[PDB]
């Protein structure tokens, strides 16, 4: 449609705002991980629960390095 591509513009707008907040804090996440984290946080999840995982998976790639 046309109004269905305007909503596909309004999601890129949000994703750019979130991409700005991700860099001015200098997080560890990149844009590709962040697209999974937005899907998780849309469902309703403890953000205290995901961060402990992400704190272990980043040290599990120092168990790969």
């Amino acid at each position: 449609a046309a109004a269905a591509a305007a909503n596909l513009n309004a999601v890129r707008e949000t994703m750019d705002v979130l991409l700005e907040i991700s860099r001015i804090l200098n997080t560890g996440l990149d844009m590709e991980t962040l697209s999974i984290c937005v899907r998780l946080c849309e469902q309703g999840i403890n953000p205290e629960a995901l961060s402990s995982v992400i704190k272990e998976l980043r040290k599990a790639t120092e168990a790969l390095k």
Binding site: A5, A6, N7, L8, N9, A10, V11, R12, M15, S35
Partner: peptide, 23 residues
């Protein structure tokens, strides 16, 4: 899925009639 569809070609023109969703 949304970020996969999100890479669509979008016009670089922005409307002068609409500031609310100008694609």
């Amino acid at each position: 899925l949304w970020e996969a569809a999100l890479t669509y070609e979008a016009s670089k023109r922005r409307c002068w009639e609409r500031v609310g969703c100008p694609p």
